[PDB]
TrEMBL record, chains B, C, D:
Keywords carried by this UniProt record: Chromophore, Luminescence, Metal-binding, Photoprotein
Family to which the UniProt record says this protein belongs: Belongs to the GFP family.
Residues the entry annotates as binding Cu(2+) 1: H195
Stated name of the protein: Fluorescent protein Dronpa
Lineage: Eukaryota, Metazoa, Cnidaria, Anthozoa, Hexacorallia
Species assigned in the record: Echinophyllia sp. SC22
Length: 215, 216, 216, 216
C-alpha cells in the first residue's frame, strides 16, 4: 500500500489577515527515505502579500524515515489515511490554524488543506516578507487521548539575521485505529529550492527522519 | 450614517477540527445603547458537533455605548466600515481564528465572517458540548501600529460548575483613517436567549458599554 | 477582625535577572473603601536597575470594596489570613513569579513577599526604565479546586507612547475554610504618587472595587 | 581552562508555592564528552512536598559535547564563567523561574542557584508527585541581542502514562565577550539514577550533545 515512490496532489484554500487565496501543488517523494518535493502554484489571491514561508510546513509525516524500533503511526494509517490539525503561534502574536485531510488514491496522496492566519502586524517580518527560511527542527511526538500529538518550537531566520520564533501544536488523527507509538522525535529540514519573483511558482523540498533522542 | 436603530445581516463560513459549516443571521440593534440581538440559522454542516458558544462572540463593537469622553473608533469608521481579526486561545489548547469584514448598506450592517478552530480535544467541553454560557467580561482596548487592539481573558461556565478560560486577541482595522482612542475598556455580556435542541436556530443578544475604569 | 482603618507592614526579598534586592514598606488603608497607600524603601540592591512598576502590584485584595451580594473571600480569611501566588507574563518574555504570605497582628497586616523575574531583555522597557504607570485594570476572579483564582490581562504605558502588555495569573489561598464566591470582577487602579530619583523611596496607592459586570 | 575531568559544587535556594527549601550538591563530569553526575542533598524544607523532577534541569551547558564546527559559547566563557536565567512554563499553569551564576574555582564549577515555582495545582502531577522522568530533549539555541537563547518544549512522563509538557525559555549570559554561534541544537538526556524515599539524597546524571540538525 505505501510505495518506495509515491506522488502528491494538493489544494490549499485559505486566508491571511482576512485576505483569501488558493494554491495547488503536485509532487513526489520517497516515504521510506523521508524525502519529498513538490511544485506549488498560486491559483487565486496572487500575488501573495505575505511571506510564503508561513505556508510551507502546511504543504505529511508519512514522508519521514522511521527506524524499525519506532512505531510508525502515519504509514500504518493508510490506505484509509489520516488527518491533522495545527496551530502555529508566532512570537509577535500572528497565529495560523491549518488542517490537512490526507487520502490515498493509487500511488498518489491527495491533500485537502485549509489555512487561516490572523493578527500578523503590518510591519512584521511576515507581511513585509523579510523571512529567509525555516531552520531545521526537531519535533516531539507523543500520544494523548488515543491520538498522536506533535510539538515543536522552531524559528524562521530573517533577512538582517536573527530569528522569528513559532510554536507548533499539531494533532494527528488516523482514520482507523492503529498502533500508537511511544514518545519520539522527528527531525525536519524544509527548503524552498526555487521560486519565481512573486512566489507564484515554488519548488518545495522536505527531508525528515524519526529517532528516539540520546540514549 | 449611524442611526439609532440599525439592522444586521451576516454569513459565517468556517470549520472546527477540519469539519466545515456555514451559518447565516439576521438581527437588529441600537448602537448608542450598546444592545443588539439576532436570529442565527445553521445552513451547512448541521447539526453542529461542537459547543455553539465558541461562535457567539464572532457573531461588532459599533454596538457599544461609548461615552463622549472616550473616542469611538467604531462609529467613526462608517460609512466605509472596518474589519477585525481575532484569535481565541482556550486553556486546553483549542484555538479559534476568526475574521469579520463589516460594511454598511443603507441601515443594515453586513458581516462576512470566517471561523476556523483546531485542536479541540474530543474529551473537552467544546466537543462534548458541556458549556453553559460566557461570563460577562471586560475587554481592554489600546492603540498599536495605527490600529486598535482588544485583549480580554474571559471564561465559559461549564455544566458541572467551574470555568473554561479563553484569551481573546483582537485587531480592529478601520477601512479609512479615523481618530485613535486612548486606553479604555469595554464591558461585555453576551447571552443565547433561546435555541432549538441542536442549535439550528439561536437567538443571541449582547450588551456592551465602554468606560475608562476606576474612578467610577 | 478587620477594622475600618488598618495598617500595613511588609518585606519583599527578591531578584530580577539574577540581581538580588530587598524592599521594606509601611502603610495604611481602608478595607471597606478599597483604598490603601504605603511608603516603600529599598534596603538592598539599590539603586534598582529595573523599572519599579513591575513590583508595584506585588506590594492584598482585602483592600477591595465588595458589594453586599458578592462573597468576600479575603475579609473572611482573617484573623488567620491567606497567601497568594502570581505569575506575571510580559509580552516580550520577561516573567515575574511572586508570593505573598499575609498575616494579621492586631490592626496591622504583615506581608512576607518573594519576587523573582527572569529573561527581561537588556533593551526592553523594564531594564531601560521606560515604563510610565500601570493602566487601570479589571481582574476576573473565579473558583478552581476549592481556592480563588484571579486572571487579568493588563498593560503598562510606555514613555514614548504605546503599551507594554502583561498577563497576570494569581492563586489566592485562605488558610481556613471560608465561603467561596461566584465568578466576579475587581476593578483596580494602582499609582505611584511620589518617588525620589532612583526610587529608593516610593509612595504607592491603590484603589479597588469588586463588581459583577454589566449591568452597572 | 577546561580540563577533561572537572568537579561541580552547588547550592540551590528556592521556593515552590511559597514554601522555601534548600539543596546542596557535589558532582563531576567530562565537559568534552557532554556527561556529568552529582549527588544532591536536601538541607532545608525537607521532605520536599513537590515532584523533585521540576528541579533537575536546573541542577550547565558547558557539559555538552560540541563538534568542532559549532562555536562553543559556554566553554569560551571561562575562567570568568557565565550566568543563565530560565522560565519553565508547564501546561497546567505551574511556572518555575530559575537562575544560575556559574563561577570557576580551580577545576570546580560553582553554582549559585535560585528557584521559584508558583501556581502548581494541588491535584496536579507536581504537587502529587506523579512524575517519572524527563524525556530526552532537543533544545534550540540562537543569538538574540548579543546573548545566547535556548528554547525547548519537552515533557515529563507520568506514573499513569501520558506526558506533562513544559516550555523552557533560557537566556545564557557570558561574563565576557566570546564568539557567538549560529542557530543550533543540543540533545539532552537527564536521569535520576538513584534516590532515597523522600528524595533527601538524589544521584542525578545528564548527557548532552550539540549538533546542527539534519542531515546526520
Amino acid at each position: 500500500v505505501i510505495k518506495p515512490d509515491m506522488k502528491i496532489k494538493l489544494r490549499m484554500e485559505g486566508a491571511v489577515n482576512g485576505h483569501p487565496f488558493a494554491i495547488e501543488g503536485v509532487g513526489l517523494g520517497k516515504p521510506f527515505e523521508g524525502k519529498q518535493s513538490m511544485d506549488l502554484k498560486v491559483k487565486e489571491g496572487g500575488p501573495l502579500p505575505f511571506a510564503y514561508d508561513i505556508l510551507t510546513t502546511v504543504f505529511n509525516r508519512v514522508f519521514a524515515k522511521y527506524p524499525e524500533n519506532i512505531v510508525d503511526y502515519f504509514k500504518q494509517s493508510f490506505p484509509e489515511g489520516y488527518s491533522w490539525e495545527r496551530s502555529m503561534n508566532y512570537e509577535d502574536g500572528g497565529i495560523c490554524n491549518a488542517t490537512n485531510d490526507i487520502t490515498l488514491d493509487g500511488d498518489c496522496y491527495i491533500y485537502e488543506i485549509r489555512f487561516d492566519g490572523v493578527n500578523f502586524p503590518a510591519n512584521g517580518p511576515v507581511m513585509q516578507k523579510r523571512t529567509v527560511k525555516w531552520e531545521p527542527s526537531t519535533e516531539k511526538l507523543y500520544v494523548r487521548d488515543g491520538v498522536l500529538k506533535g510539538d515543536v518550537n522552531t524559528a524562521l531566520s530573517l533577512e538582517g539575521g536573527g530569528h522569528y520564533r513559532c510554536d507548533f501544536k499539531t494533532t494527528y488523527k488516523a482514520k482507523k485505529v492503529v498502533q500508537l507509538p511511544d514518545y519520539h522525535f522527528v527531525d525536519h529540514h524544509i527548503e524552498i529550492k526555487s521560486h519565481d519573483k512573486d512566489y507564484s511558482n515554488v519548488n518545495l523540498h522536505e527531508h525528515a527522519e524519526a529517532h528516539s533522542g540520546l540514549p
